[PDB]
């Protein structure tokens, strides 16, 4: 929705600012795992560590930051897959969240978002 | 090929080791821009900053780390687009290289590689 994209953009900009500058990072914030995770964290996607809930909320987010229905479904399919894989094991909840984001970024979901197709 | 892939895997592992541990990074090295850039740098892809040369070498790399012909072509199309866009402007050559990698990662190319899978 046009209300939530305004909000997410403001959150990306703020994450860009507060996140530590570290070596070898792309200038494009939407190419950065730490920015996406930071942004999604603020939208509450990871406020509850239950994998089923993270999955619900991620799929909801796909609808939203993407308009094309085909790409919306691809995002949902990928969110499900990434949550299933990356919430297994003994890593911390915060690191699992970061890994989920990395999995989605690697899969190409970021490219299909309105944030990327309106820079 | 299998020989090139053996070499790249060894380069990824070594980049994983030598690269600074920075906050909020995925455990998956193939999800990391700094690892990919580090790996591709070692294969000489950015050994000459001429955009035309970076493009030729990137497209060549697509054929080595991807087997599906359809995905090979997509990688090539994306490499071309990223080099064209991210080598413009006054940023340093090294940073332009990193930005190229970030552009390809964002586009999904990493997912289609044999290393990933
Ligand atoms: C999969 C739900 C949003 C992911 C953000 C793309 C990096
Ligand atoms: C410059 C080489 C393109 C392949 C990078 C994959 C992320």
Concatenated DSSP letters of A68-113: -HHHHHHHHHHHHHHHHHHT-SSS-HHHHHHHHHHHHHHHTGGGGS
Q: Which chain A residue has its CA at the smallest distance from B29's CA?
A: A102
Q: Which of B23, B38, B103 sits opposite A22 (nearest CB)?
A: B23
Span A1-119 CATH architecture: Orthogonal Bundle (1.10)
Q: Which residues line ligand 1 (CB under 6 A)?
A: A 36, 58, 61-62, 75, 79, 101, 104-105, 109-110
H helix intervals, B19-68: 33-42, 51-65
Closest CA to B100 of B116, B73, B81: B81
How many helices (H) and strands (E) would you count in chain B?
A: 5, 0
Burial A65-101 (b: 16+ CB within 10 A, else e): bbeeeebbebbbebbeebbeebbeeeeeeeebbbbbb
- How many whole angstroms separate alpha carbon A95 and alpha carbon A49? 11
- Three-class SS of residue B87? coil
- How many whole angstroms separate alpha carbon B65 and alpha carbon B95? 23
Task: Return all residues near A107 (Cβ < 8 A) that are at least 6 apart.
Answer: A78, A82, B108, B111
Closest CA to A25 of B35, B54, B110, B93: B35
Task: Return all residues near A30 (Cβ < 8 A) that are at least 6 apart.
Answer: A12, A36, A110, A113, A115, A116, A119, B106
- How many whole angstroms separate alpha carbon A73 and alpha carbon A41? 22
Backbone φ and ψ of A18, nearest 5° = -75, -25
Give the nearest ligand 2 atom to B97 CA: 1
Query: Any CB–CB contact under 8 A between A85 and chain B?
Result: no
- How many whole angstroms separate alpha carbon B54 and alpha carbon A30? 23
How do the domains of chain B map onto residue ranges?
1-117
Distance in Å, alpha carbon of A3 to nearest chain B alpha carbon: 25
Contact criterion met (CB below 8 Å) for A31 and B33: yes
Note the ligand closest to the C-alpha atom of B46.
2
- How many whole angstroms separate alpha carbon B111 and alpha carbon A118? 24
Q: If you ran DSSP here, which 8-state letter would residue A19 be given?
A: S
Packing angle of the helix pair B51-65, B2-18 (nearest 10 deg): 110
Experimentally determined by: X-ray
Resolution in A: 2.6
Read off the tokens for B31.
């999800």
- How many whole angstroms separate alpha carbon B27 and alpha carbon B74? 26
Task: Return all residues near B32 (Cβ < 8 A) that are at least 6 apart.
Answer: A33, A102, B25, B26
Span B1-117 CATH architecture: Orthogonal Bundle (1.10)
């Amino acid at each position: 929705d046009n209300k939530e994209l305004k909000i997410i953009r403001k959150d990306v900009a703020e994450c860009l600012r507060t996140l530590p500058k570290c070596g070898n990072q792309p200038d494009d914030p939407l190419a950065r795992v730490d920015v996406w995770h930071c942004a999604m964290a603020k939208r509450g996607v990871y406020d509850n560590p239950d994998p089923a809930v993270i999955k619900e909320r991620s799929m909801k987010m796909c609808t939203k930051i993407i308009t094309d229905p085909a790409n919306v479904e691809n995002c949902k399919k990928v969110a499900s897959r990434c949550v299933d894989r990356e919430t297994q094991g003994p890593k911390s909840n915060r690191q699992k969240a970061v890994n989920i984001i990395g999995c989605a970024l690697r899969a190409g979901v970021a490219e299909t978002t309105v944030l990327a197709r309106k820079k």
